[PDB]
Amino acid sequence: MDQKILSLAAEKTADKLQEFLQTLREGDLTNLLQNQAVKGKVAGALLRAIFKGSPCSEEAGTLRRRKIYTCCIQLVESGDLQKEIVSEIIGLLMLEAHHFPGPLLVELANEFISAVREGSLVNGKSLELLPIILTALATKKENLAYLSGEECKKQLINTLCSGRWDQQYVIQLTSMFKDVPLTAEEVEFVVEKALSMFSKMNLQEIPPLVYQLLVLSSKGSRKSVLEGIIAFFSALDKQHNEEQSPSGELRHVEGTIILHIVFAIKLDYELGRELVKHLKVGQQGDSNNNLSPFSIALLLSVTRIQRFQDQVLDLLKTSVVKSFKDLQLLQGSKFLQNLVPHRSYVSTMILEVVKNSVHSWDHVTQGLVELGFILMDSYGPKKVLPSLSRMPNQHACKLGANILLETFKIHEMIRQEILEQVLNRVVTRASSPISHFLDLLSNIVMYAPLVLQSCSSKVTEAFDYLSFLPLQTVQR
Amino acid sequence: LLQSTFSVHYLVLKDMCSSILSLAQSLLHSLDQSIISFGSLLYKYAFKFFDTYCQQEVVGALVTHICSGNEAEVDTALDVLLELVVLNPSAMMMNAVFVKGILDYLDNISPQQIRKLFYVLSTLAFSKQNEASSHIQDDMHLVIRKQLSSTVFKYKLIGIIGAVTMAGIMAADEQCTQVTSLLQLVHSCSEQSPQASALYYDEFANLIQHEKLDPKALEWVGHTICNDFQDAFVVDSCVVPEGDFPFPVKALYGLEEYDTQDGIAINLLPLLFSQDSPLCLAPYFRLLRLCVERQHNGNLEEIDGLLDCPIFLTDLEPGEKLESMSAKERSFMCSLIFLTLNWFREIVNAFCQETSPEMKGKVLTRLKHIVELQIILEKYLAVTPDYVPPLGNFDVETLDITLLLHNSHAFFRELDIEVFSILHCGLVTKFILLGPPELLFLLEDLSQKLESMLTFSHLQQRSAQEIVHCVFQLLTPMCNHLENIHNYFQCLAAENHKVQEYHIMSSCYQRLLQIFHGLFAWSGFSQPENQNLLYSALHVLSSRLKQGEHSQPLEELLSQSVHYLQNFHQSIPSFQCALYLIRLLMVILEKSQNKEKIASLARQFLCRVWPSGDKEKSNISNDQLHALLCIYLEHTESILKAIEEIAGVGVPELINSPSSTFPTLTRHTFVVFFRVMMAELEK
Known part of the structure; x- marks a missing residue:
């Protein structure tokens, strides 16, 4: 039945193939079903023959093309073919999907929406046709009536994103929109829906979704996406804390969301700045409730970006001072205690970061250490060589210390770098008061000295400087 | 330094990745290619000698560099990528994952960069052991699919190039199924677009010649390509084609050794007019030529009808009668001569390697046809200096965009280098008793070739060293004969003293000397490895006076070479050739006492008559004189005494000639002489 179509297709166009095309009027379905049963390349050959034989200047071919479109779209998913013929089918349809008027492509997109909403699209490879159709509608300056093709595209995509997405096919739906030429509002609706979806998904299917969101965010919508991911994970952490009043899953999620946002910010030096501005506490004097165990985990992984290191750390430092100024003022003062609801303080958040940190969070901890030593370096004592200089400095330094001890309990690979950094500030200075450092060191060591017979050399080289040290230093 | 650093002290440095x-x-974010290359070496050895973690950080950083990127940085980074994969693919394979995620970002990248990028990714992909992760293969198929499926040529080209390039890589028969499906889809997509079909054919042709692999998939396609060519353009030879042309359309510029009442003719003007397919004819024939040469091993018994074939053309004649009617027809004529020239250049590309003497004669007849149509075309472009046909070459120029000097190089089909095997044929001097114009064409081409390359797709994929290596064979010991015949011509042109034969041979001499200058002023002779090729060249040029002096000392070869070369200064008919001869002698004598020869020779050129034809004195234009006098006055033994000589001859310009006792010294050229004089006084 095929070889005659090949032979009529071999020589010439729109003379014989059209006239044979008006012989076999019905069942393109059985043809392609037996064809995929035998061999897909024969089906590709037939498809080329029909599409060249049924041009879209004439209108009879268009309905055969429409029916074969519905046929192949359903069979590529429901009919389990071989991968390669599937690919050839879709490549072909994608290619010939240009030559059309508006309303035929409009009804194809309506078929896709109405399928993907309710029709369990068993795989979903057919949705790859969807963007090209809308692409054609963007470029089809043949006027429709229902309007421009782009306005039909607006309506259709709005109806798609407002309509229900299946839980398993938001990745594919989103990955399709990487390519469609979206304006601000379109991509805003896209991300609004995609963010909406998170809650109704397995946790292990959140990391890649976010990934695709951010490579999409690079079009328009960064502030929205990040505020969103912050919001969702903050709520997860709060839920977990109130239920505790799972860690392995929640943690590996937050800890790979952050990796993925970091990667994007390397690839995009502006994502970071909008992140920080959105999250900057020091707007006037005010502590914002954007900041969170996750909000902070993210920053301390970000701090290993060269461009932001300084700026992130300086933000954190100033935020922590502000924290303590606030807390001092509150505690001295009942008038404020009556009014304000007790918000967690940044100190506490960071420490809590450290507990969650325990598992698998090398990228956060390596920022932590730097942070803490910045705290100690900055707010070690100086004024002997009061309220304002003591408590939010003492507590800053001893925050440093608390951090680095807590980490030194559990993160056994940033030992010898706490240790070496401690010693580095021990030995040479002897001019700036260094009381806090030995106190720290004492706690550190007492807690597990057995972990310094794994980092021992670092001690014996400070013994060579023991001759040169002031006396209180050495005994202690 | 860095080399020995990382080779000896790795054990130190590993700690400090x-x-x-x-x-x-x-380092890379700045300019200054030497900086950026240093950064390259950092990344390379960093990945070479350290551990895994470092390797990962390397690749990640490179990814960052590419993606965020600007052009220099990008390119370097991609080169580095290539280095990393060719150095250690096995290690790179497990970090291929981050490499793949680049493809999410293509908005920034230029098609050249894209070519390298897909090369890398595919070359990594079809390692045999990581078909477990054929993932990347599928994603690349996906992105190919999406780009090809676009109206926008900017995307079309990307998809095309990616697909073809991928296909070349996998062909070191499921592979055959993939490549066939791929290329058929690409062919179908590109069928719509003339500037896209051309790119497909051209890029596919060059890519196929370069890879030289997967011949089966090539035996598959050639059976399609021969048929599509011989049905697409080849028509029965009817001297009048169908179509209402305001032009007497014949089967013009036939070789006429074939039967005039024949089958195979090629329809051109009705195709380009019905378009306003024929734009693809040159590259498509190129593709057919390459495929049949790969299949039949250089056997062109099927095609040689095409070297003989007449072309269905209008009368492309010097249309001084068709003057002052600028319209869509003048673009038609300029484009038609453009297309027929591209066609003939592709023919001479095709049949130059073939050694049958009848075919060589046919090629020479095509060469004279070419030069005739070249002079007609540059005249037609002199008629209207704005009718440019924008049809560039595709490696760089087409992505760059999307009069006679533009077309000669960039617009026309670029010839091979084996085409200069044609200049073997001896000169037959029509005045005194391979013609003068068929050699003028090749030399004018070869000049633009070596200037472009050493100081353009097909040439630029070859290194400079191999290019100069093969030009050393196909110029010097074969163009010496033509040089000597030219010396004998211009000796009689000097002895007697019609215009056009002397003017053409003068320009041939000028071009020959410019070729020698470009050849020997190659900056790859500063490197110590390349001096043997120069040593062979000067052995040849020394052997042009006397033979027997083999394995000579260097300064002896210089002395013999310059002793041969100087004595052409009496045969030089114009100034450009003199300037190029003196600078040639400079750059050959720069290897060595020598000051005196150049000084002596420049004075001879300044003392010479230089017959004052108007165009002849226009070739003694002010900047040329300035350059020559700066050469003379700088290279002389004593600058001040030379200035006293010039200020002893520059003052009698007023008294006698209202043209001096030291000619090429008038009041017009006095300005430049004065300026260079005071400039060298300051120096």
Whole structure:
């Protein structure tokens, strides 16, 4: 039945193939079903023959093309073919999907929406046709009536994103929109829906979704996406804390969301700045409730970006001072205690970061250490060589210390770098008061000295400087 | 330094990777290619000698560099990528994952960069052991699919190039199924677009010649390509084609050794007019030629009808009668001569390697046809200096965009280098008793070739060293004969003293000397490895006076070479050739006492008559004189005494000639002489 179509297709166009095309009027379905049963390349050959034989200047071919479109779209998913013929089918349809008027492509997109909403699209490879159709509608300056093709595209995509997405096919739906030429509002609706979806998904299917969101965010919508991911994970952490009043899953999620946002910010030096501005506490004097165990985990992984290191750390430092100024003022003062609801303080958040940190969070901890030593370096004592200089400095330094001890309990690979950094500030200075450092060191060591017979050399080289040290230093 | 650093002190440095890269990122972001190359070496050895973690950080950083990127940085980074994969693919394979995620970002990248990028990714992909992760293969198929499926040529080209390039890589028969499906889809997509079909054919042709692999998939396609060519353009030879042309359309510029009442003719003007397919004819024939040469091993018994074939053309004649009617027809004529020239250049590309003497004669007849149509075309472009047909070459120029000097190089089909095997044929001097114009064409081409390359797709994929290596064979010991015949011509042209034969041979001499200058002023002779090829060249040029002096000392070869070369200064008919001869002698004598020869020779050129034809004195234009006098006055033994000589001859310009006792010294050229004089006085 095929070889005659090949032979009529071999020589010439729109003379014989059209006239044979008006012989076999019905069942393109059985043809392609037996064809995929035998061999897909024969089906590709037939498809080329029909599409060249049924041009879209004439209108009879268009309905055969429409029916074969519905046929192949359903069979590529429901009919389990071989991968390669599937690919050839879709490549072909994608290619010939240009030559059309508006309303035929409009009804194809309506078929896709109405399928993907309710029709369990068993795989979903057919949705790859969807963007090209809308692409054609963007470029089809043949006027429709229902309007421009782009306005039909607006309506259709709005109806798609407002309509229900299946839980398993938001990745594919989103990955399709990487390519469609979206304006601000379109991509805003896209991300609004995609963010909406998170809650109704397995946790292990959140990391890649976010990934695709951010490579999409690079079009328009960064502030929205990040505020969103912050919001969702903050709520997860709060839920977990109130239920505790799972860690392995929640943690590996937050800890790979952050990796993925970091990667994007390397690839995009502006994502970071909008992140920080959105999250900057020091707007006037005010502590914002954007900041969170996750909000902070993210920053301390970000701090290993060269461009932001300084700026992130300086933000954190100033935020922590502000924290303590606030807390001092509150505690001295009942008038404020009556009014304000007790918000967690940044100190506490960071420490809590450290507990969650325990598992698998090398990228956060390596920022932590730097942070803490910045705290100690900055707010070690100086004024002997009061309220304002003591408590939010003492507590800053001893925050440093608390951090680095807590980490030194559990993160056994940033030992010898706490240790070496401690010693580095021990030995040479002897001019700036260094009381806090030995106190720290004492706690550190007492807690597990057995972990310094794994980092021992670092001690014996400070013994060579023991001759040169002031006396209180050495005994202690 | 860095080499020995990382080769000896690795055991130290391994500890301190982080620092290296916090450096290397800072190095590339700046300019100054030597900086950026240093950063490259950092990344390379960093990945070479350290551990895994470092390797990962390397690749990640490179990804960052590409993606965020600007052009220099990008390119370097891609080169580095290539280095990393060719150095250690096995290690690179497990970090291929981050490499793949680049493809999410293509908005920024240029098609050249894209070519390298897909090369890398595919070359990594079809390692045999990581078909487990054929993932990347599928995603690349996906992105190919999406780009090809676009109206926008900017995307079309990307998809095309990616697909073809991928296909070349996998062909070191499921592979055959993939490549066939791929290329058939590409062919179908490109069928719509003339500037896209051309790119497909051209890029596919060059890519196929370069890879030289998967011949089966090539035996598959050639059976399609021969048929589509011989049905698409080849028509029965009817001297009048169908179509209402305001032009007497014949089967013009036939060789006429074939039967005039024949089958195979090629329809051109009705195709380009019905378009306003024929734009693809040159590259498509190129593709057919390459495929049949790969199949039949250089056997062109099927095609040689095409070297003989007449072309269905209008009368492309010097249309001084068709003057002052500028319209869509003048673009038609300029484009038609453009297309027929591209066609003939592709024919001479095709049949130059073939050694049958009848075919060589046919090629020479095509060469004279070419030069005739070239002079007609540059005249037609002199008629209207704005009718440019924008049809560039595709490696760089087409992505760059999307009069006679533009077309000669960039617009026309670029010839091979084996085409200069044609200049073997001896000169037959029509005045005194391979013609003069068929050699003028090749030399004018070869000049633009070596100037472009040493100081253009097909040439530029070959290194400079191999290019100069093969030009050393196909110029010097074969163009010496033509040089000597030219010496004998111009000796009689000097002895007697019609215009056009002397003017053409003068321009041939000028071009020959410019070729020698470009050849020997190659900056790859500063490197110590390349001096043997120069040593062979000067052995040849010394052997042009006397033979027997084999394995000579260097300064002896210089002395013999310059002793041969100087004595052409009496045969030089114009000034450009003199300037190029003196600078040639400079750059050959720069290897060595020598000051005196150049000084002596420049004075001879300044003392010479130089017959004052108007165009002849226009070739003694002010900047040329300025350059020559700066050469003379700088290279002389004593600058001040030379200035006293010039200020002893520059003052009698007023008294006698209202043209002096030291000619090429008038009041017009006095300005430049004065300026260079005071400039060299300052120096």
